[PDB]
Design a protein around this ligand. Structure first.
Ligand SMILES: Nc1ncnc2c1ncn2[C@@H]1O[C@H](COP(=O)(O)OP(=O)(O)OP(=O)(O)O)[C@@H](O)[C@H]1O
Ligand SMILES: Cc1cn([C@H]2C[C@H](O)[C@@H](COP(=O)(O)OP(=O)(O)OP(=O)(O)O)O2)c(=O)[nH]c1=O
Ligand SMILES: Cc1cn([C@H]2C[C@H](O)[C@@H](COP(=O)(O)OP(=O)(O)OP(=O)(O)O)O2)c(=O)[nH]c1=O
Ligand SMILES: [Mg+2]
Ligand SMILES: [Mg+2]
Ligand SMILES: [Mn+2]
Ligand SMILES: [Mn+2]
Ligand SMILES: [Mn+2]
Ligand SMILES: [Mn+2]
Lengths: 287, 683, 683, 287
């Protein structure tokens, strides 16, 4: 009921890194404090590292196990955007703002970071556990994928959106907004594929899949809170970032056809500003 | 999770292998004591509450100014004296979430059930304190439920119209199409559902001013109307809902039906517009014989004969149209079209089916016009006349649109109180008042028809509930016997009240003299046949209540001939969905879909057992999907023989049923005199 | 492959290193001798042909009856006395495939070029045989070309409206929106382009009847308008065309622009509706200073001040709106908005840009109203007054809706004949006749404004063709000097003709007394500045023609003060799309897009060299994409100082130009006085 | 030395079939004989099948096994083109020219056609035989992919090109030329990756790999001959098409770094005829 519509929306959102000139960001970048520059670098590396997993494994593995030519095509298109567009865009932002040695060090740090690794490996673990012709394992991976697309990225997206809403780092903020817009539709689409599997299950199996999804969400959420304090306490933003995580967790759940888990909260206004045919047989007419 | 919601969820927790039905009373009590009493605004006296409500632009002061405050206090005491208690959590939840007046911030509760009942009764009485007390007793006893628009909006300053169902005739011209779009938007802005008849529009590929192939057909107008309804979606609180009806013999029938195919292109697909098909007996006859059929171009017929195709008798004019070289027609396969209808209903539940000859063989106002289409709920069947909207600065020829204000009898409560006559007459009075106080100043045909025809719809609900609580199977012959007797009595007393109103006001409805009531042909079956219960068990249910006999019907016929009738149409059984929870009743006359209703409100799931459900009546609360649709058709046909308008008839289908089974159900309904089929619901 | 197509295709076959431009005369000769002379319906004499055309519902008999047949014969002989020959295949092909009258079966040619010109002249003269002969000479000489509607439909019974440009003001109400949809469909049905001003509609998220967040914004109305224009497709041969204009300070401006993004969701995309933006000087000032700007919710402003936001001076009211708490506004980046506009214009060529302060600082009728928006072609700039369409049975408050009938002077032929004054006056008379003979029956404001304002649009075409055929570069100072002198003379003689018409008829346009013509403020620059050519080469082109001086302008100013002015608007330079081929002239005052125009008709491709194109003048026929858009802006601004309305100004951009180049071009156009920017065409 | 330039070339060649309006072919299509229309439909259906498998299976699987984020980005982009652009374009052509029943019939015909099933079996079999970290199985699949890109498509491409060259079906032909332009660069790129693996081998191993490549080519060739006769005999063109496929077989071999295998022949000359955003600065507001 939905793949051709998503095909259309995906292809009409096509864009390339070269379209946004990045050099003019240096005119606001130079005015940020060390903590602001540090947080931005770390957030950016976090997003980059997670998105690479999605391009190399997440989207291609789902495309492999999903049946249907049109679904495989949409999924291929999404994988292309991760690898050919998003990955180049993140690299471009980095190369503009930091010298080569600084980029290498930030990636070394974020690669060793406990909270980034915990979530990255949790997601990758579920992708690696998909078994041929087993729709339950596929569903679990789709849940992981939706959580990445619609939830885990947002502790990171917060900061570029926060600057973007203030008139700072506008070129890279425009790029991030385009990336985020792609991840939103990716999350919604994979969510619909997961609901299709979920709806084919018994009531007991459904309850079991719901428990899986909520348990996974809880593990990721508790790690996000730690990840958030680790990055944002130094710039005083953690309280507001936490509200943004919960709001996006609720969107991820709704993508999977589940009820919101967290109470509704208002979001930081600066970030908001950034954002069976059968024939009649001639006797059916007589009674 | 709220405490009351936890108590309600204990309903499903089986104890001793039995549902804990008593947990719902505890759930409702907890709900009240913990939320409703807390969030209910406090007023020292009724005078202060009334002053606060009037000054703060909550109530209309005009209707309350017709009573001395002593009379208002007496009416409110009458409402409160009953000490009415909601029997289930869902009833109180629905009332206090949908109909209970809340502060402008939707934070506190300003009205209780008694307050709303008293305000509605005072609005109905129009300055009569004793009449207001009678209305309060009727509503608090829950013998009568005014339609959701009337119940919610009566006596409120910031209210929509009390009438929520409108039918619009569309003439074949750009002026008429634009006026139809404007009227649909105006009526949806008022919250009412709008049904449009598109059978007079010429088919795709017809000439516009002697230039051929210029017309877009009914599908372009359908796209226009769908966008108009989407735009005027009631400020976003309720998406604009409209229905389009096309005669099956219209050339655009296949394109019209294809707008509801899932595979349909987004350009042709219509998303928010319901579609119904008007099937004359000629189409069913053609399909039965497997003969090749023809669909006609309406404008060619209009030019050849000077009349619209849907204004003519298809059963007589079909052969003439086929033999006329100046009439353009397209060969079709009638059985293929029937199977397409069945498959489309299975996939989406559309289109609605209106059996035109079933509607008009008993139609009392064929002199005014034949019934050509139905409303958005498929229970409104009245004569309409198309308006001629001309160019600016010219005079418009205003015709007759269709609108009726609805009310539902609570069958269980009416039968328990043995008050069919009193309840029916009071409901007729309230519906007449609602019609009289209604004035739409942007739908000239609707306003004119409301003033001229004085049409009301008096429905019924809790038929399955009442039968199950009395140990009667919905599909049993005893249930049909009870329905026959009860609805015969309802029709008798509604006709008597209409005649009494006509005598009191010394005025009938426009063109009454030509109606079957005036000539007496309406009462033929009532004066020649008896409708008293044929089963002793059903006859006992009516003990203490006078069942009108043939002599009573003859006396009523003479009375109507002497005084006439005030209402062109009186009875129509609308779906009555939202207010069924408040009334604690089964929706309309349909069988229950599920014994216990599982709903999600926020993140909390609520459990609603069928009203009166228990271990001893579990078997009688049979779900609709498990019933024989032929028996449901038999029940609806038994009821429909006493309803002047239609009955909103939903078909409940199992997923294993093929399109052939749906077609057989449709053909049996047409055979059994069914007028309209509302929805094809599949499990 | 027809012989004429073979000859025409020989144009691109280079012989001796040069194009064979002489093949086009052979191509047109063969086209005629082998297709047109064969497929031309034969009549013994003019009397028989005219009788056949009138009898068969081809020609209206109303205009022909005003002349004795001797007069009609004399006019037709005058048309044929010139022995007019189409110089290229494309001109004759265009005429005989678009404008030549063909039988109802579209197989034969009833009208030659001379017959069409004679019919148009007879229609214009309104019974004046000498006037008809003057019109015949004017059109056969191709000095004046009536617009496509007037030229094609004049004297035809089946003819549509002779006016094709319509501007509608939409008031902020459901009644007004429905009336706007109806009027748009009615005018599209007539084949005219309809432009709507959406700046008065309240933004998305505004309250309807003290109900907050209910309004859908201008995008829902835009969806309604898009569907209406799609439905009224004018038989589908030419899809319904509508334009929506929104002020840049409207809240919905971002959503208004997002409807044209390719990435936009289909439920928001508006396929058939062109969009223009109205940019006051305040927005440009805010972007220049990089200051944060605000977009306002129009209904809050209307409630606070009792007047619409677009009815106020933003340069005076912006600070008050920002400082007023009761006015709702949200912050935007003016430079980000300008960049978004440039990106959208690069991607899709939209929106049209109207510089409101550039338009209104020279507007002569600011007392009637300021120019708030433009038309579908972006050159109509007139005062409009919104209408108040009330409920049914309530009298409507009809305002002023803009419309003008178009005509184009052929600059090359007007200069060759040295007949600027006579051609301008005859064109003004013909435009006045077309305006007086127009009566729109479903656009009350359009008809009222046509009666009151008597606005006409007299454009020009073949500027680039004339300049290239005279050894003058389009971007050169001499080209701007010639344009200045020529359009100053055109304005002088059109004002003189308007004043003479006012004197002869004894009436001026409504509210003329408050105009700058009446007070003399219009003639300040003409009485203070001399507009004679400053180059000897340009001054020689005007030899034999009297160039008005400051004394002549003083005399004209005194004459206008004495007698007034018949037309509120006289001059507008429309694109003149398809009728330029018939005249063998370049389109409007824009530079040519290609030296040789390659097009595919049917399955055979045709080549159209620019008129007068040859080896000697090949270099002067520089293509627009190769031109400095700053010099094009300079030329258009030079012309615009003598045009009271706007000029359709297309931007021709190379694919290598960034959004900054487009933004700089727009900023330079605003700096130079450019009123509107039509399209961003990229090579 | 080459991936970056292929990346840039691939992304700059991006297109969608909707860019080309197809209603212009309606008349030249109507005018073809029933035999010609039948061959044309079947030819494009055979192409659709090849692109379906190249997009669903071939390109994603090669992407999985090739090392390097940039190489993977190119291969992912090529995969997207196969199924999201190329395979879909054929449906755009079908939906314009043919009624639904003829479309349904031709897709049923691909399922039961023995030559089309054989070629799919052979190519997809090799894709699915790739073993992780086994460069030889990867080489074999890359040879198969080059043979699909640069040889197998051409029995299909012949006919749209043959019409385009006569000024017939030129809108459909424009789509096909865009597809062909893509496949040419896809065949070169995959060819270069195959050569990388081949060049790592001993002389003895190389000799075996050439045997594999030539044996596979001959097996595919013999099947393609029968397919060509089956499709083209009814339009009288089988011998001409055979010359064309031999020509392209040589190009496939060359893409693999091997010598041409078939002798040169004259191809039908008709078929040969068938072949930014930057910010506004303050000075931008002054003149
Ligand atoms: N280029 C053209 N434009 C318009 N009409 C043309 C053109 N060429 C030919 N005709 C029409 O075709 C007729 C025959 O053309 P042709 O050149 O053969 O005429 P002719 O006998 O030489 O003399 P004349 O030019 O006076 O007609 C012309 O009289 C004119 O009616
Ligand atoms: C104007 C117009 C009409 N129609 C359809 C809708 C109407 O039902 C039908 C008639 O239009 P009308 O408004 O009645 O046009 P008309 O009265 O001038 O022409 P006629 O004398 O033939 O009646 O044509 C279109 O489909 N598209 C259009 O653009
Ligand atoms: C009725 C309606 C109006 N509108 C918009 C269109 C109009 O420009 C705007 C005003 O509607 P109006 O028709 O003017 O409503 P109103 O005058 O009764 O209420 P108010 O005086 O507060 O304006 O609201 C919607 O968006 N949706 C709707 O359903
Ligand atoms: Mg009409
Ligand atoms: Mg209003
Ligand atoms: Mn990504
Ligand atoms: Mn993603
Ligand atoms: Mn491909
Ligand atoms: Mn390829």
């Amino acid at each position: 009921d939905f793949t051709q519509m998503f095909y259309n929306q995906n292809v009409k959102q096509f864009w390339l890194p070269e379209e946004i000139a990045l050099n003019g960001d240096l005119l606001t970048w130079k005015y940020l404090g060390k903590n602001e520059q540090d947080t931005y670098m770390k957030v950016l590396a976090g997003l980059t590292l997670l998105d690479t997993e999605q391009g190399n494994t997440g989207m291609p593995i789902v495309a492999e196990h999903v049946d249907g030519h049109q679904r495989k095509a949409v999924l291929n298109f999404m994988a292309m955007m991760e690898n050919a567009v998003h990955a180049k865009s993140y690299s471009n932002i980095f190369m503009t703002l930091a010298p080569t040695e600084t980029i290498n060090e930030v990636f070394e740090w974020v690669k060793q970071n406990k909270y980034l690794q915990k979530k990255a490996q949790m997601i990758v673990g579920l992708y690696k556990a998909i078994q041929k012709d087993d729709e339950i394992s596929l569903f679990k991976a789709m849940v992981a994928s939706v959580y990445l697309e619609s939830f885990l990225f947002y502790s990171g997206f917060y900061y570029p959106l926060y600057f973007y809403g203030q008139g700072k780092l506008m070129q890279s903020g425009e790029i991030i907004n385009l990336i985020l817009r792609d991840e939103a539709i990716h999350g919604v689409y994979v969510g619909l594929l997961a609901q299709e599997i979920y709806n084919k299950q018994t009531e007991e199996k459904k309850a079991e899949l719901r428990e899986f999804a909520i348990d996974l969400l809880n593990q990721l959420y508790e790690n996000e809170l730690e990840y958030t304090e680790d990055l944002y306490d130094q710039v005083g933003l953690s309280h507001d970032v936490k509200k943004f995580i919960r709001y996006n967790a609720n969107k991820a759940l709704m993508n999977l056809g589940f009820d919101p888990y967290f109470e509704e909260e208002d979001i930081n206004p600066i970030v908001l500003n950034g954002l069976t045919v059968e024939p009649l047989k001639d006797d059916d007419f007589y009674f | 999770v709220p405490k009351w919601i936890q108590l309600n969820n204990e309903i499903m927790i089986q104890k001793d292998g039995k549902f804990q039905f008593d947990k719902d009373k505890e759930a409702v009590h907890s709900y009240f004591v913990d939320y409703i009493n807390q969030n209910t605004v406090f007023f020292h006296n009724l005078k202060e509450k009334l002053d606060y409500l009037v000054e703060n632009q909550y109530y209309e002061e005009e209707f309350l100014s017709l009573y001395s405050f002593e009379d208002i206090k007496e009416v409110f005491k009458t409402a409160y004296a009953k000490k009415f208690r909601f029997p289930s959590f869902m009833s109180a939840f629905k009332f206090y979430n949908d109909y209970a007046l809340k502060t402008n911030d939707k934070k506190k509760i300003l009205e209780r059930y008694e307050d709303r009942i008293s305000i509605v009764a005072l609005f109905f009485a129009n300055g009569d304190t004793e009449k207001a007390k009678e209305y309060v007793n009727l509503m608090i006893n829950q013998e009568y439920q005014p339609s959701t628009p009337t119940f919610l909006n009566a006596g409120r300053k910031r209210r929509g119209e009390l009438v929520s169902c409108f039918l619009l005739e569309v003439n074949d011209s750009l002026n008429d199409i634009s006026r139809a779009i404007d009227i649909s938007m105006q009526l949806s802005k008022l919250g009412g559902g709008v049904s449009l008849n598109l059978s007079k529009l010429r088919a795709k590929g017809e000439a516009i001013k002697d230039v051929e192939n210029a017309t877009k057909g009914v599908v372009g107008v359908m796209k226009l109307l769908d966008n108009a309804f989407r735009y005027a979606d009631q400020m976003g609180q309720r998406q604009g809902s409209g229905a389009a009806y096309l005669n099956i013999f219209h050339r655009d029938i296949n394109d019209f039906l294809d707008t509801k195919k899932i595979s349909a292109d987004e350009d042709v697909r219509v998303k928010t517009l319901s579609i119904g098909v008007v099937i004359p007996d000629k189409f069913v006859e053609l399909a039965r014989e497997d003969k090749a059929a023809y669909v006609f171009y309406p404008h060619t017929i209009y030019k050849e004969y000077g009349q619209h195709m849907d204004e003519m008798d298809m059963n007589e004019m079909y052969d003439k149209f086929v033999d006329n070289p100046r009439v353009k027609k397209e060969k079709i396969n009638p059985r293929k079209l029937l199977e397409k209808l069945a498959m489309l209903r299975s996939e989406s539940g559309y289109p609605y089916i209106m059996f035109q000859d079933n509607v008009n063989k008993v139609h009392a106002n064929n002199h005014i016009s034949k019934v050509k289409f139905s409303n958005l709920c498929s229970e409104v069947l009245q004569a309409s006349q198309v308006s001629s909207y001309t160019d600016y600065d010219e005079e418009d020829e205003i015709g007759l649109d269709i609108s009726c204000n609805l009310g539902s009898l609570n069958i269980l409560n009416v039968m328990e109180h043995k008050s069919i006559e009193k309840t029916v007459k009071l409901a007729t009075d309230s519906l007449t008042h609602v019609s009289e106080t209604t004035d739409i100043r942007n739908a000239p045909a609707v306003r004119r028809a409301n003033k001229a025809m004085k049409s009301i719809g008096l429905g019924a609900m809790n038929l399955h509930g009442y039968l199950a609580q009395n140990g009667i199977a919905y599909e049993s012959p005893e249930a049909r016997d009870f329905a026959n007797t009860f609805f015969m009595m309802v029709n008798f007393y509604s006709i008597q009240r209409s005649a009494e109103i006509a005598k009191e006001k010394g005025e009938t409805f426009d063109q009454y003299e030509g109606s079957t009531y005036a000539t007496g042909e309406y009462f033929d079956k009532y004066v020649s046949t008896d409708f008293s219960p044929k089963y002793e068990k059903i006859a006992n249910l009516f003990e203490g209540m006078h069942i009108p006999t043939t002599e009573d019907w003859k006396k009523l016929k003479a009375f109507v001939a002497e005084h006439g009738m005030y209402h062109s149409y009186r009875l129509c059984i609308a779906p009555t969905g939202s207010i069924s929870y408040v009334q604690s009743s089964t929706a309309s006359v349909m069988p229950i879909m599920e014994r216990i209703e599982e709903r999600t409100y926020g993140n909390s799931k609520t459990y609603y057992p069928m009203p009166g459900l228990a271990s001893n009546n579990w078997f009688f609360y049979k779900e609709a999907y498990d019933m024989d649709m032929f028996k449901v058709v038999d029940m609806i046909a038994t009821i429909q023989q006493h309803i002047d308008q239609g009955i909103s008839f939903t078909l409940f289908l199992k997923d294993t049923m093929t399109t052939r089974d749906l077609n057989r159900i449709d053909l049996y309904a047409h055979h059994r005199g069914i007028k309209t089929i509302y929805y094809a619901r599949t499990k």
